[PDB]
Design a protein around this ligand. Structure first.
Ligand SMILES: NC[C@H]1O[C@H](O[C@H]2[C@H](O)[C@@H](O[C@H]3O[C@H](CO)[C@@H](O)[C@H](N)[C@H]3O)[C@H](N)C[C@@H]2N)[C@H](N)C[C@@H]1O
Ligand SMILES: NC[C@H]1O[C@H](O[C@H]2[C@H](O)[C@@H](O[C@H]3O[C@H](CO)[C@@H](O)[C@H](N)[C@H]3O)[C@H](N)C[C@@H]2N)[C@H](N)C[C@@H]1O
Ligand SMILES: NC[C@H]1O[C@H](O[C@H]2[C@H](O)[C@@H](O[C@H]3O[C@H](CO)[C@@H](O)[C@H](N)[C@H]3O)[C@H](N)C[C@@H]2N)[C@H](N)C[C@@H]1O
Lengths: 273, 273, 273
């Protein structure tokens, strides 16, 4: 990927204001800010500046300052050290689609970096301590991966080809990057196997501490080690219609009107069933 | 909550010395220190200064410096970036009671912030990678929580009321904040469900990687996914008397005298049974 | 332990160049660099400088800079905040042997600090969120460990002796520090019990989220809570010969030649069986 979660915000919300850095500036912050005018935060004002808190640590201090009461969550301030943070619009994590009001931890950001993710839906909650890791080669005399560094150009060839041919897909090789649907909840200390999973269905619930080794159907609940299907969120009737209506792609338009539907499943289907 | 773990220490142990910052100062450190006199650490002396190490990283460097051999653990130095660290006196984590020589990771500090915790006992060890998270709404068409941000004032009402009425207590709503007793041990990669747990009994042991979904009785051992009662630490005789004596509330007074009792359970009951 | 992963590299690869710090300097970096000449990175050149990125965050920014394309992974740059990072040569983590192209997270670095580790083999991959923790005392009225701080010199004696006598080895007391063989893979959110484990066999695979309570035989696969032996990587024939040949101690010499053997187990034994 190429661009910063902050810069996507600044490109959309800065609106000719100065960036006000609230916190100790880092190397890659200073770079992400070089297209803009910035200075260390002193006295701030939503009319004059965009406050950028470097770390979540720095954000708590700003919010606890009386000057923060006029700044709206994303239109006026942001936390630099939070590439998995949620936004009110569709965004990129490296080059990975992430829908509105979707969030994930650094473990998922790295999976976005390693090309493990094809896409992440809308209104999806992935806890920070979740993880997405692929497998190493299991059909070889060795299991290590950093022995590669000792390989020369010749040995590298014969090694990379067997990885491409392996149908178990070590390092998610020769497969499709996995997809995460919308309205998905993922517990903590969880594991989705990038070497065997290609699709988390929309609405799929992944319990805490669950290790998910196969694709999860939409609106399924999975817990345990390994993950088993404990229940389904909704009767199948809802499931087919929910795939049809796709509430998660509604604009803020249809969300506030149909709040009574989105809140009572019973009310949702008496109108859309 | 309102106040800093460091400031509670400085209010009690500074004793008219200067704070000596050992490390790169952060935004919220600089604020926590504005009631006091401070300067970047150069040459230090327990008579002259209170050394404040910013991060646990910065603490290791100070202890490894020859100037640190005269500073006692809490009376003379402290690590700013350790709100879950243990103290020799009863303290607050935000507005949460935390007894003496009790510690926990940032996951528990956030639960203290989210109001999930009512209290934490004395001499309780909670590993850093432990976690306390509540559940989202399960009786709604959606499971997401940050869709809220898209709600207006009108849709917000009808949404918040159903949360208050939900007996499953999403986000620990309309329940009592959970309590953690004294002499409690909690393994790592563990989970206590703030949406269904209200009391960890005194002495309760929570094995590593265990997901705890219901209240744990005092002095019970729980492991597995989900957590089951593997054994009890003590015969019930000890349990009733341990609730009566409550050694964990002894001053340092009765601790050093009754060390032979506190060390041999057999000796503990021949004196208190 | 005594010395820095960076300093072991600088002592071997600096070769009369200047250290160029890429990132905000920390207290313990500034100390690790005091034997050398250094300055904040401006324009860099592998001939003139050794680039030191402070944090993994700072490393990503350097690699993404056009000046980084001439710097080789370890000979020319390094990440200070990565004591578990892999190296092309045998190294120390505190005073713990760590072989070539071996890596582990901070959880394992702390175990190296707590003296829990005797050694770590070659070409071994331990994920960052892995952990190695010992147990507290289970034969005492209390389970807490920081009550110790309240003990005086007298009560300390009678407490420390019972720890030394405990055959369950709380805090890995009176046992041998555990050993991790070569070609070992360890999943994330995993647990090796320093209070009951003394040897992870060479080639042993530890699945994600697995809690390992007993020694693991060489080339065994363990998953589940608690860990059970799911399968063996190789037929026993390979296992005995793999212990004999010990490919992991080959120089880069025998690695690139025998790549066809190291890649096809079938080819490995037709030559070494
Ligand atoms: N604070 C209580 C809430 O925590 C979570 O949501 C919260 C998310 O966890 C938050 O996510 C942020 O915090 C998490 C956790 O540290 C990070 O993984 C993530 N990258 C960062 O953006 C996000 N910024 C706010 C959202 N309300 C729970 N899913 C719901 C709970 O009520
Ligand atoms: N060092 C070995 C010990 O580690 C732990 O205790 C230790 C605690 O884990 C320590 O807690 C500190 O370290 C932990 C872990 O990083 C952090 O979660 C916590 N917030 C921080 O305050 C605390 N400062 C010291 C205490 N001896 C084990 N419970 C016992 C073990 O012998
Ligand atoms: N990037 C994808 C790869 O991630 C891992 O390897 C990678 C290791 O996890 C890396 O280790 C580094 O990153 C890990 C994870 O953050 C840290 O625990 C560790 N201390 C740090 O040195 C190491 N520097 C590079 C190595 N290729 C997987 N084992 C293999 C996967 O293909």
């Amino acid at each position: 990927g190429m661009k910063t979660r902050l810069e996507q915000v600044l490109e959309r919300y800065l609106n000719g204001r100065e960036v006000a850095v609230w916190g100790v500036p880092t190397r890659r912050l200073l770079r992400a800010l070089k297209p803009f005018k910035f200075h260390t935060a002193d006295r701030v004002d939503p009319q004059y500046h965009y406050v950028v808190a470097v770390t979540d640590d720095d954000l708590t201090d700003f919010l606890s300052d009386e000057q923060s009461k006029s700044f709206q969550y994303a239109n006026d301030y942001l936390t630099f050290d939070d590439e998995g943070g949620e936004l009110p619009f569709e965004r990129m994590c490296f080059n990975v689609p992430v829908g509105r009001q979707t969030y994930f931890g650094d473990g998922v950001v790295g999976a976005c970096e390693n090309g493990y993710i094809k896409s992440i839906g809308q209104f999806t909650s992935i806890n920070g301590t979740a993880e997405i890791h692929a497998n190493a080669q299991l059909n070889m005399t060795f299991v290590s991966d950093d022995i590669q560094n000792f390989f020369n150009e010749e040995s590298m060839a014969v090694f990379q080809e067997k990885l491409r041919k392996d149908p178990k897909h070590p390092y998610a090789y020769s497969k499709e990057p996995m997809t995460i649907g919308s309205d998905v909840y993922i517990g903590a200390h969880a594991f989705i196997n990038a070497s065997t999973v290609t699709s988390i269905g929309d609405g799929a619930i992944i319990g805490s501490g669950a290790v998910v080794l196969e694709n999860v159907p939409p609106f399924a609940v999975v817990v345990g080690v390994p993950a088993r299907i404990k229940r389904y969120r909704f009767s199948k009737e809802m499931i087919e219609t929910l795939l049809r209506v796709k509430w998660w792609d509604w604009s803020i338009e249809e969300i506030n009107e149909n709040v009574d539907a989105l809140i009572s499943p019973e009310l949702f289907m008496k109108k859309y069933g």
